[PDB]
Design a protein around this ligand. Structure first.
Ligand code: UAA
Ligand code: SF4
Lengths: 1010, 1017
């Protein structure tokens, strides 16, 4: 008999890289280290003077782009601040707190909805907004070592998920039907330029109800700058189209080929044609030119941002123009004049055109570059060179082409003025020159078409900063054309700003007034129509979510706000008869240590030694009458508690019913009085009796709130059904101790004696318990009403309890970790969930989570043949090979889809249709098939080489994984048993997956059987 | 009767900023936004062209510095990878995975120990290592949106906490007593230069046992470059002293004032004096000079890094020079020639001296700057200007002061060669010039003192890259002097590398040989002597940690490795008689959703539908015999399980004892198929008592009953087992629960195409609150009755919590499923530290290994400036502007004082009481537990916020608003909270505050009066 407790040679070999603590310090010469360091390099080599080749490489280079996995973490990291500063720093006032809350809750739709409600170009802004100088600039978390929240990427993600769902926009469902709309709304509205400004504007105008909105775009393409100049590698043209279509869904009309200039469209022709109001949003169409570049042409090698960028655009953006154009042939040293943010897109774009080298030359110093840092960094990392303090003077042309640019040094004196020493000339070689000095409105033909609107000193139309109204009442402008906005988000806000007032004006013209306070509509989709109401025990809940008798319902005042927020129902904190008045101690509510030293938002649990309500039954019953008086459709349930005494239970239960309570909830946490547990809720007999007393006392339905601290909850659940209860609430907090300091003292620690008692654990940490409890009671007493409580904190989790047999969902800890508004997330979230169950083309998704696609850092993994199954991890020499292979592919491709909405191909389920549907899958252990075994399969393309799966299987598994010592890539061997631990600890979602075993399974007995 | 369910005017006002969802889109003009944006600005203004004044401001500017709260997050974020690449990228091979794991477990000492075991200059390296180019460069987490782990900061922190503990170093406790050490070790060893290289080297040499080690430092100060040049705002001099002292604890001797020169100290004088071996670590003492700077002097405004930096050092580093040193007066435009990393310390430092403007001028392009990025950004952000493609040619002087520097343009031709166009001259104004072209060894007096060692073509001593041995067998070199190392960490490693071989050589000279495989000692402290053994039920545990009957013990082969790792004891996966052989399904083990969508390390729980062992009792029993045969001191406990049948329980239980098992554990998870206390045996006291009786009469070795938590009263089953004869109980097993469903309603784990499942067991940290109660409750009911705790143990500290609650030994599982067997090292060194600190009087304000939290921001202490406290200036917008002004004013004030700052008094903390032993702490926490009635409701408290620590999120505000008593005011301009007198001390806010110890509960000074809503009759 070999030595059973010793690894065989084969296995000892497989464990070669498994962690083992050393007994001595390691010896490795500095030289050996140097040589070896290059193998694992993951980031840029500061000693590398080049970088891969980027010719015709328009892959997304944004550092902010996030994948689901990563979106969820950051979303969870967000503090979700009150009166958040990031929103104050956002041009369109996006409720960041809210949409980010929705994301951490996996309610992407809700998040997407919140973003587009205030920003029609949500997806685009999330990709281009210079967040560092806007929202992220005020991020509270900037005051932590970890830093500010990547608001931008988070917005990008939620919007992207939403776009993928293929849901159309729809007018507010509350608006009167088309025909019933006042005359005023049919006025002909016109917008010039299909840019952010105009797209934003027309959208809001359409939301308000206006039926005749037309946008006149000069070019053949829409989207303005977002299409004509911003790089494909920063903002995909596909995104623009997405947002444009969303607009069209509301009827907005776009007509390309029409321009605003004398002989074409003019304020007069429009007035003459019957247009009641017009929004000018053509931006700054022409490049800022300079003398020294006169006569120069593209053939020679001269461009202006306005010339260059649009060419690369049209070339790299499939769908922009019908004509597939070439990618400008830029070879040799390129010189971009200027340090504006545009200058940098030119620089980086130039490299995609084949530029050998690119120099950014500005007339000031480095510290004077006012382009957003994030933008500069891209250039700098793609190895663009910088040359400061140089002002252009001459473009030396020899042989019909440019060969050099002549500069002159600049310098800043005491007073802080800039001088140019005309003595110190400078010759810089150059094969191409691109000037990024800016854009303006010069064309007198256009300037005229705007007569007689008054122009300011900047030679731009003048508008009231608040109304966006020009000198002519029916004419408003906004965006770049006005000169205030320096961003997409700001121009979008301009269109938006203007929309309201254009509305105010048009209405006035029809002798109609508008509210005093601005009421621009929110964003709406068919999802918002889904019905999430439910009936339980004869009670009609407008929506399944409610506040559970706890902290969130300490005062009736709170419940009121709760209802105002939109909560389906609520429980009054548990109250009792005067003789049982209680008095709380302090501290009494503490955070959970169930998830480690993680402080802030999203605590995995709480523990509390708080007693019932300290407020009198008088207070509560009055409060109940009040509440039900002002909120007749919100269900109010009174939570009452009495000792084991029939008269008491009947007295109190009648009093509550008398106040108007829709129903009652019996708090069975009181002591029996003799030494099953100490509490009433633990003894079936007692439970049954208390339930009888109340049954005979009142007529309104009442439910028993069961405790989970019992050997069999189904028995007390049954005893209450036998006692007359109309349903059970499952479950109350799990008893436990939340911890001790190193000194042995507890927490909470009451009084100077630092004492405490067993408290109740609430939160996500007890969901597994409440869930079992609900699913067990649901199979034992089918149909019997269950109000679930315990770890519900999102629409998805709440759906889980519905699927487990619950009809309504109680919440507490989730609101202690946040606030009443989460209700908005819950409803919009549950709606989305049910709505998606009707979309056939989206069955590969898990709720609102699309199917995970092989990606690295959130961005997809290139499907190049020369890369697949080559075992090239993303580090060291392997990464070098990857980049080459990828560049080779781009060059090969250089040598080388209608957006329709998804229609529900089935009726949208209703709460009742989903309650308990998950029960079918539950069974005993014997009903689980042990012939249908599985094994783990790793996707090397998604793996981050941590080796976690390796270690789990090594010290908690079957040593069935090989971990290459050079590529740090894992490979599950066929000794795998499919326990599923690895998958469980993989830090990359869906990198590891369980698949059906193809070979015969044979248990490991160690020693054969007799 | 006012309207009770309506907020009164005052409260509606207090809720003004409370969140409420909007009904319509927001209307805010683009202009209004612009004006408002500057009020919340937190980060730099891309439009502002000037960084606050930094004159005489040597505060820490490192972006990596971490505080405990922050260190704990990052530590937890670390994947703690296998064969970690970051370690491979570390020149000292620091077991990063391990020390970061210890940090995440609050075991700072263990962390600190690990780091110093491989890097005697741990604290320094953690602050200066150019991680981007080293360890961090290969961090797997770089492949995530969040990015690579701040290894440097993590090391800094652990080191910093350790330094605070004031614990001395001691020689390997397993080395023979001083007098019993061979002659060889008394050899006179000498090292030149008290720099990182030498400091590391001597240290290791001293660790090996050598008793005569002396370092000859030229200057009057120690620490080398780390003292003379690296900025105080990057590396505080008192860190250097800390590490030097740690060395001295090992006997190493340092003598300043002695130099290695042809006049005084030389290889020959040393040999003649009797020194058996010498290590050269003098670095590159001289600055690289250029002709164009001939004749220029400091008075004119010229310096070389070697001239300038040491001046600012001596002036800004209290404790370096005893003498009072003037802070160089640098006014006007400064020009730093070079783009080396030193060039940048010069730029930043220059600002501290009062420079009005600083220009970094290099002869190549921006892409050609070879300084690590983190270092470059420092300058860039303090607004230093850059001027590329310029080579110096002449320095102009007028009045005897510099006033300009003449340059010539440079450029690259298509062949990649750099040319300097002598025609294009450049006049650049300048009041001061500092050349940072590098350092070298030229002084022929020194080069001579090294005769006859052979020099290579770089004009530096030549040494075997592996042995660090020069042409002369008794002489080794390392660090900068050799020319390979570019970092502190690398020079440390050189000293280290050289140490071993110096060892090998010295031994040989005494006719002794050394192991084939290098055995450099680890780092040791008195804490490592702490005794963490414990006796329970007659069994002697070498340490209380052990593997609980589960996955980590699926095969005896694993238990073996576990013992090899050092685990005190282990449980065999539960096994039964042949007739009860089981077969598992799959999937069967899944991650917990108890902590949200957090994937990777540190799972809050696991749920599993795994049955007992699939391996035969034959296998186990032989395995037990083999295990106990090889590991006599490691307790092996067999976990057995049989139906409710006396013969079986007695058969199996005897077979187990027969194999040699130290004790047995009864798995009472088999059903008792008898009608209607649930279905399992462990849920019925009668059945538990009986099974315990059967086993009591069958065997003699102690056995325990592993109680299940899924019972209405666990104490009853615990008593029933004590009555049945058991020698103790294990508490508790997994909690029954369902881990969740997908959107489609199907569960997970989902077995078969039918996607079915059953109620599984929840394990991990998510059930610790249950297991702890279970333990503390059985501990008070049956005092003295042995309890083997199990349920959420994942660190020394948590383990100590179960000892404090009455458990004597701690079982582990989920924690190893989340990691691996080596966690044991963390646990032991952790528990050690804990008990050890309990005897230190001066560290009572701490909570275990956590120092008392100090008012901070982003991990840095808050300046206690009189004109800054209670002024309500939050760290954002114009308030931040005022703060910075007030702080610069304070620095200028401090300069006008020129007060010399008293030297360093680093004295070790001595245990002023015997170090407790496990027995001395078991159950000590039980005294505080009581009923609710024993809780005083007259000793009420309220929350009090530290505005200096607050990050203005407003979470406390929202908790108290929708889950509290609307007791907090949240200013609309400073976003600073203020708890009012309406507070009841519920403590929810403190619970949700994201900043540790920002909110604290204090004794209520105003009388407490419960809110009844409506008065009583
Ligand atoms: O146990 C807890 O944590 C909270 C609680 C207190 C109480 O009196 N009743 C109840 O149902 N729950
Ligand atoms: S000692 Fe330096 S090179 Fe090594 S793990 Fe630490 S910070 Fe990285």
């Amino acid at each position: 008999a070999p030595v059973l407790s010793k690894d065989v040679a084969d296995i000892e070999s497989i464990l070669a890289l498994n962690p083992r603590t050393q007994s001595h310090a390691a010896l490795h010469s500095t030289l050996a280290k140097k040589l070896d360091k290059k193998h694992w390099k993951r980031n840029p080599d500061k000693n590398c003077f080049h970088c891969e080749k980027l010719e015709n490489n328009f892959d997304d280079i944004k550092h902010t782009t996030l994948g689901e996995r990563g979106a969820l973490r950051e979303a969870m990291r967000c503090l979700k601040c009150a009166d958040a500063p990031c929103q104050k720093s956002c041009p369109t006032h996006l409720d960041i707190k809210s949409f980010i809350t929705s994301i951490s809750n996996k309610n992407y739709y809700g998040a997407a909805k919140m973003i587009f409600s205030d920003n029609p170009l949500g997806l685009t802004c999330g990709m281009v907004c210079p967040t560092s100088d806007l929202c992220v600039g005020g991020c509270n978390l900037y005051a932590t070592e970890e830093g500010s929240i990547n608001i931008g990427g988070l917005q990008q993600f939620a919007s992207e998920v939403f776009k993928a769902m293929n849901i159309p926009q729809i007018r507010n469902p509350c608006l009167p039907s088309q025909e019933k709309m006042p005359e005023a709304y049919s006025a002909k509205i016109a917008l010039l330029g299909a840019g952010p400004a105009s797209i934003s504007c027309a959208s809001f105008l359409a939301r308000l109800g206006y039926s005749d909105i037309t946008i006149f775009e000069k070019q053949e393409y829409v989207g303005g700058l977002s299409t004509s100049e911003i790089p494909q590698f920063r903002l995909p043209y596909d995104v623009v189209n997405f947002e444009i279509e969303l607009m069209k869904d509301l009827g907005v009309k776009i007509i390309c080929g029409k321009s605003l200039s004398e002989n074409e469209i003019t304020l007069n022709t429009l007035k003459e044609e019957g247009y009641k109001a017009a929004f000018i949003g053509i931006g700054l169409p022409e490049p800022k030119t300079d003398d020294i570049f006169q006569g120069l042409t593209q053939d020679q090698g001269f461009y202006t941002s306005k010339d260059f960028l649009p060419l690369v655009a049209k070339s790299s953006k499939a769908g922009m123009c019908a004509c597939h154009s070439p990618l400008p042939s830029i070879r040799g040293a390129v010189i971009v004049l200027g340090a504006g943010d545009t200058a940098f897109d030119c620089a980086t774009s130039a490299l995609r055109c084949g530029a050998r080298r690119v120099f950014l030359v500005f007339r000031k110093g480095f510290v004077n570059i006012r382009a957003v840092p994030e933008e500069v960094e891209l250039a700098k990392e793609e190895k663009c060179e910088f040359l400061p303090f140089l002002s252009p003077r001459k473009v030396i042309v020899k042989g019909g082409r440019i060969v050099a640019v002549q500069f002159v040094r600049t310098e800043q004196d005491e007073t802080g003025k800039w001088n140019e020493d005309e003595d110190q000339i400078v010759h810089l070689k150059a094969d191409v020159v691109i000037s990024a000095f800016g854009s303006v409105l010069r064309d007198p033909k256009v300037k005229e078409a705007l007569s007689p609107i008054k122009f300011n000193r900047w030679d731009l139309p003048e508008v009231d900063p608040e109304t966006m109204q020009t000198s002519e009442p029916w004419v408003f402008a906004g965006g770049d054309i006005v000169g205030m906005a320096n961003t997409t988000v700001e121009s979008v806000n301009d269109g938006k700003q203007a929309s309201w007032y254009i509305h105010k004006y048009i209405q006035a013209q029809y002798g109609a007034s508008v509210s005093a306070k601005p009421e621009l509509p929110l964003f709406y989709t068919p999802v918002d129509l889904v019905d999430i109401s439910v009936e339980m025990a004869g009670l009609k809940f407008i929506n399944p979510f409610g506040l559970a008798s706890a902290a969130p319902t300490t005062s009736s005042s709170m419940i009121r706000r709760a209802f105002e927020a939109g909560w389906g129902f609520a429980l009054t904190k548990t109250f009792s008869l005067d003789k049982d008045i209680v008095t709380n101690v302090s501290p009494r509510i503490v955070r959970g240590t169930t998830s480690g030293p993680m402080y802030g938002p999203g605590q995995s649990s709480f523990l509390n030694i708080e007693l019932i309500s300290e407020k009198t039954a008088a207070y509560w019953c009055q409060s109940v009458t009040e509440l039900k008086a002002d909120f007749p459709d919100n269900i109010v349930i009174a939570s009452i508690m009495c000792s084991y005494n029939k008269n008491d239970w009947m007295e109190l239960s009648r009093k509550a019913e008398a106040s108007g309570a829709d129903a009652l909830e019996l708090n069975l946490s009181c002591p029996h009085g003799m030494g099953m547990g100490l509490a009433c809720g633990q003894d079936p007999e007692l439970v049954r009796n208390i339930c009888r007393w109340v049954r005979q006392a009142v007529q309104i339905p009442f439910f028993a709130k069961l405790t989970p601290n019992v050997t069999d909850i189904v028995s007390i659940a049954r005893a209450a059904k036998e006692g007359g209860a109309d349903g059970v609430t499952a479950t109350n907090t799990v008893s436990g101790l939340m911890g001790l300091k190193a000194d042995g003292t507890p927490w909470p620690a009451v009084g100077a004696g630092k004492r405490t008692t067993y408290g109740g654990v609430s939160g996500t940490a007890i969901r597994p318990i409440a869930l079992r409890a609900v699913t067990t009671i649901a199979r034992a007493l089918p149909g019997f009403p269950i109000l679930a409580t315990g770890g519900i904190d999102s629409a998805e989790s709440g759906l889980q309890f519905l699927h487990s047999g619950a009809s309504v969902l109680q919440v507490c800890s989730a609101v202690q970790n946040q606030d009443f508004t989460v209700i908005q997330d819950y409803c919009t979230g549950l709606k989305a969930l049910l709505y998606l169950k009707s979309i056939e083309e989206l069955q590969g998704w898990d709720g609102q989570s699309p199917g995970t696609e092989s990606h690295q850092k959130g961005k997809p993994v290139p499907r190049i043949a020369e890369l697949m199954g080559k075992k090239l991890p993303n580090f060291g020499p392997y990464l070098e090979q990857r980049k080459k292979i990828i560049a080779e592919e781009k060059m090969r491709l250089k040598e080388q889809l209608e957006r329709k909405p998804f229609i529900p191909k089935k009726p949208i389920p209703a709460i009742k249709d989903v309650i308990g549907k998950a029960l079918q899958y539950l069974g005993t252990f014997g009903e689980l098939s042990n012939i249908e075994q599985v094994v783990a399969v790793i996707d090397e393309e998604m793996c981050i080489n941590c080796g976690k799966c390796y270690m789990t299987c090594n010290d908690s598994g079957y040593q069935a994984i090989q971990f290459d010592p050079e590529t740090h890539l894992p490979t599950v061997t066929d000794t795998c048993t499919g326990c599923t631990l690895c998958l469980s600890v993989c830090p990359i979602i869906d990198c590891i997956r369980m698949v059906s075993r193809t070979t015969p399974y044979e248990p490991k007995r160690g020693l054969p059987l007799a």
